[model samples]
Each structure stands twice: as C-alpha cells, then as structure tokens.
Target chain A: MKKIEAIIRPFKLDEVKIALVNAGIVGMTVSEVRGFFLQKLKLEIVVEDAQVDTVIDKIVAAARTGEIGDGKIFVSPVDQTIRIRTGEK
Target chain B: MKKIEAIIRPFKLDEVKIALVNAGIVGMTVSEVRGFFLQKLKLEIVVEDAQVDTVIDKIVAAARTGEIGDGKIFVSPVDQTIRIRTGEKNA
Candidate 1:
C-alpha cells in the first residue's frame, strides 16, 4: 500500500473528503498543519498501490484553486498497518 | 527515517505521550482524528529506522486496552523532511 498525504487549503477539506469518499477512499487521519507559513490541512490516506493515481487525481481536482498555496501532495510506501485492538493487519 | 502514526483512543493520549518522552523519543504531533467511525488521536512521529520499533512499542504499551476500539498503527517510509522556515532538510 502507498500512504498519500496532501497539504491542502483549509476550506477544501469537506470538498476533498467528499470526492475521496465518493471514490470509496477514506482518510486514515486529518490534521491542521503549517506549510510555508500558511495554515493547511493534512489529509492522509492509505490505499492499495493500484489506487494511488486515482486518489491523487481526485485530491488535486477537489483541492486546487489555481493559485499559490493550493498545497502539495506526498506519496510514500507503507510497510505495515495493524489494527491495535485485534492485533491483526 | 520512518513516520509512524498511531491512531489511539483519545483517553490514551496522555499515557502514550508520557511513554514516548520517557523513552527519549521526545517529538510528536498530536491531532484529533476519526479512526474508521470512532474518535481517536493521531500521534505522528518520525524516527530513524532503528527507532521505529522502539517508538511503536512505547505507544502500544501505554495505549492498548485490548478493547474493540484501541485503534491502529501504521509505519511509512520517509525520504526526508525539511523545515519550511529554515529550508533545512532532515533536521
């Protein structure tokens, strides 16, 4: 799986989230963060490798405003994830 | 470096944090998150490869309740992280 994180415009949260949910993608976490001195939201989602491009495309489509600070996205490899309560992946 | 994010029960935040600090893994970003359907806190910590399991063990020991919503943990490969203000990479 690949973990995709997007630093996005704050107001774009709901819209971005909707697009992902509609695409059947769900966030693993969401938080406020500072990027280049501007307030931004971090949207993190872990998805199967097959869905990386689609997920990134949806995020760009929903979060972009054609202006500076529209935000940046990062894609990284996920080694493992376990549901703590169940002790299972 | 590896970024390890632990989604834990909200009430476990303090305990988990204390364990982290005591182990000399003193940094983390704490934020509220909804894990699946339950309220949770996300602890984001980046550590050198050798510290991955060290950090993970600290968190799990403090946060696990063996209940249905103890939450989850994920480890990701990080190339490098830079501080935007300082333009320093991997500092």
Candidate 2:
C-alpha cells in the first residue's frame, strides 16, 4: 500500500477532505502538523497518508491554492497494515 | 489509539525505532516518504501512530537533531483502530 502525505495550512483541511470524498476515498488518517518550506513560513499542515491516488490529488489541489507556503506533499509505500479491528491485512 | 505521524531525515529511522522499542512499544508502522517545507524541500516522511506516550516520545527524541530540515511531527486523534493481524483493539 502507498501512503500519500501532504503538508498544508490548517484552513485547507475541509477543502482537501471534500476533494478526497468526491474522489471516492472513504478512509484516511489526518494529523495536526506544523511546518514550512525552507523559507520558514510556519503554516500549519495536516499530514494524512493512505493508499489512494484520488486522495493524494485532492490534498495537492487544496494544499496549493496556486501560491507559495502551501506546504509539501509526499507519496510513500506502506509495507503492511493491520486493521486493528480484524487483525487481518 | 492515536496515530503519530512524523517527517524526519531517513537516517534517523534507526534511532527512533530503537527508542520506541526501548520504551516498550511492541509494534509500529513506518513508511518511506518524499517531502520538504514551503521552500520545496525534499525529505522523507514516516507515518505511524499508537496510544503509548513512550512511543511518541521516542520518535520525537530521535527525530530532532537541532538542525534545519530535520523534519516535523504531528499527533492526532484516531476515531477508530483495527489490528489487521488479529483484529484487536488496545481498548
């Protein structure tokens, strides 16, 4: 599985979430984060990663409102996952 | 259980892992990621979470080197959790 990570301003969370849902993504993990570019913008970004492209795209669009300090995004591979409820992959 | 996701230099993975293990954290999930700051910095990010403070503390301790672009950390509330291996909850 791949985990898509994005860093964006706090206000953009709802927009990103809506995009993801519209993109057919039902599950995700979000974190309240703080980071900026090398410029040290100090904009709050929520870090959410999952194994979905639509989810990633939704975040990217919302994160970057065609402006700087929108934060960064990443896509990474997740080796394994435990549903915590079912304990099955 | 809350998931703690962190972005740090890839080299620090071991230090952070060791710290978590020592803190009695038996399990965790780590991912190799690409990211940076608003300046378009390119660094690896890892996402993982657990209910134990020891685990989170271990990650924070190892993730910091007091240098630029070291990485950032975040802790959030997880409404639900499921253990895929056996389908168990810490609760």
Candidate 3:
C-alpha cells in the first residue's frame, strides 16, 4: 500500500479535508505539525491509498491559495497499518 | 529503514529542518508534540528511514540554540508502510 503525506498549513485543514472527502477519500490521519521550509502552524494528513495522483490532486486544488508556506507533500509506501486501539485490521 | 523522533521547543524547528535538508534529507514527517525534558513545551518530529545516525547528528547539531531547554531525539526501525488508495510500495 502507499500513503500520501501532505505537510500543509493548519488553517487549510478543513478545506483540504472537504476536498478529500468529495474526492472519495474515506479516512485519513491528521497530525498537528511544524516545519522549517514553512512558518509555524501545520498539520500532516496520512492518507492510505493505492496511488497518490488522485489524493495529491485534491490536496493541491484545495490548498492552493497562492500563498507562501502553503506546505509541501510527501508520498511513501506502507506495508500495513493497524488500529492500535482495537488491534483490528 | 530507521525513524528519528525529536522533542524540542517550537522556535528551534526552522534550524532543525534546514539542517536535515542540507544533510540530504529530501522528506521528513512533522507532528505537533508536547514533551518534557529540559523544559515542558511543544513540538516533536518523526522521520522514517533505513539509516538514522546521520539524521540524528544533524538534528542535534542544528537544533542547538544553547538555551535552557533544547530537546531530545529518538531512533527506531520501520517495518512497512501501505498506500490505501492503489496499494503501492514506497515505504
């Protein structure tokens, strides 16, 4: 499996999230974050999917406001992920 | 691969990120984390990879503002990562 990781400004969280859902993404992991290339106030979305193009497109469209420090995106491969609380797949 | 986890003050983040990029790290994971060591503040980072020693050194070196509360770092191994959409391999 592949995981799409997007490092973006925190304020745009709702916008990007709405886009993802509209694009048919079911669930994602959101982490409050901070980075150097950009200013403070950030969040990372870990989206599990088979391909990255779809998710990336949605994020780019939703997050693009022509602003500095909009954040960058990273796509990586994943072997598997389990729900720690339920220990269920 | 390996993962590097660091707990530091929010102000020193820029230095640390620049240092990592300069050290040839193209990508990394950032999470807003609160920790207690020298001082109890917020900010934490998690970097995944096969080799961690180099990254660890870079973070330690760059994050040093020589203040009262700096931060702490950790390293670990990654088993696997999955792509939920297409189920590709890049972990």
Candidate 4:
C-alpha cells in the first residue's frame, strides 16, 4: 500500500474531499496539522501503489487555486492495514 | 518502524489513550479529524514492526463498541523516525 500525505489550505478540504469521494476513494483521515510555521490540513490516504499517482492528481486538481501555498503531497509505502473490527486489510 | 493511523469516534479517545499508554507504547500524536460526514479523532503511533500487530489488537479492543462506525486503522512503513530533541532511533 501507498500512503499519500497532503498538506493543503484548510479551505480546500471540502473541495478535495468531494473530488476524492466522487473518484470512489472514500477511506481517508483528515487532521488539522501545522508545519513550516503554517496551519494546514493533513489529509492522509492509503491505497495500492498503482493508485498513488491518480489520487495525487485528484488532490492537486481540487486543491490548486493558482496560488503558491496551495499545498504539498508526500507519498510513502505502507506495509499493512487492519480494519479494527474485521481485522482485515 | 511502522506508523499506525486510527480514525475513531471522538469520545473513545480517552479509552484508546489509556490502552496505548498501558501497553508501554506512549509516544504518539493525536489530531481532531473528520471523515464519512462525521467528526472523529485520529491517533498516530510509530513503533517497530514486530509490535504492529499487538498494537493494532490493543486499539481495536479499545475502540470497538459493536457499532457501525467503530473506526479504521492503517499501518504504514516509515523509513525512519527521529526524535527532534534527542535525535535518537534506538534510544
């Protein structure tokens, strides 16, 4: 699995969330995170490696607004995932 | 090391927190998060791979309530982790 971490403007969350859901990628977690002396939302998604590029594209499309501080996305590899109740990946 | 991310109901934070602490896994970061049209708490923990399964079991046991949205946990491999103040890995 690939972990996509996106740091974006707080106001852009709604748009990005909608775009992600519409794209059939609904499992995600959002955090009000701060870094580089700026307040932003840290949106995280874990998906198959093959899907990383597409998800990043979706996020960039919805988060960009012709601005410099639009956001940044970092991709990392995930070893496993477990749904708490089902204990299934 | 492994990074375990859990999105659970806000009210379950305390129980989850206590469970993690009691498990001898104390270093973590907590954030207020939203998902599935509902508000939730996101708890992140970084630990060695061998402990990942045990940690997940602890979280599931603490966070579950026999409800529809007990929450989800994602486990990711982290290349490295640094303690800002001490700069230690095996410390």
Over the stretch A1-89, how does candidate 1's per-residue lDDT look in tens digits?
Answer: 87877777789998988999999985568879644335678888999989977877787888877776676666678789888889998
**Best lDDT goes to which candidate?**
4
Select the stronger candidate by DockQ from 2 and 4. 4
Residue B42 CA error for candidate 3 (Å)?
8.0
Q: Rank the candidates by TM-score, best first.
A: 3, 1, 4, 2
Estimate every model's Cα lDDT from 0 to 1.
0.76, 0.52, 0.61, 0.77
lDDT by residue for model 4 (A1-89), tens: 87877777889999999989987896999878644335778888988877766776788778877655565565667779999999997
Ordered by DockQ, highest first, the candidates read: 3, 1, 4, 2
> What is candidate 1's local distance difference test score?
0.76
Taking the tens digit of each residue's C-alpha lDDT, what string does model 3 give over B8-54? 77777678778877877754556565455344334333445534777
Can you tell me the CAPRI class of model 1? incorrect
The predicted structure with the larger DockQ, 1 or 4, is 1
Residue A44 local lDDT, model 3: 42
Best by DockQ: 3
Compare the candidates by TM-score and give the number of the best one: 3
Residue clash pairs of candidate 4: none
For candidate 3, the per-residue lDDT at B47 reads 49
Candidate 4 lDDT at B55 equals: 94
TM-score of chain A of each: 0.94, 0.72, 0.74, 0.93
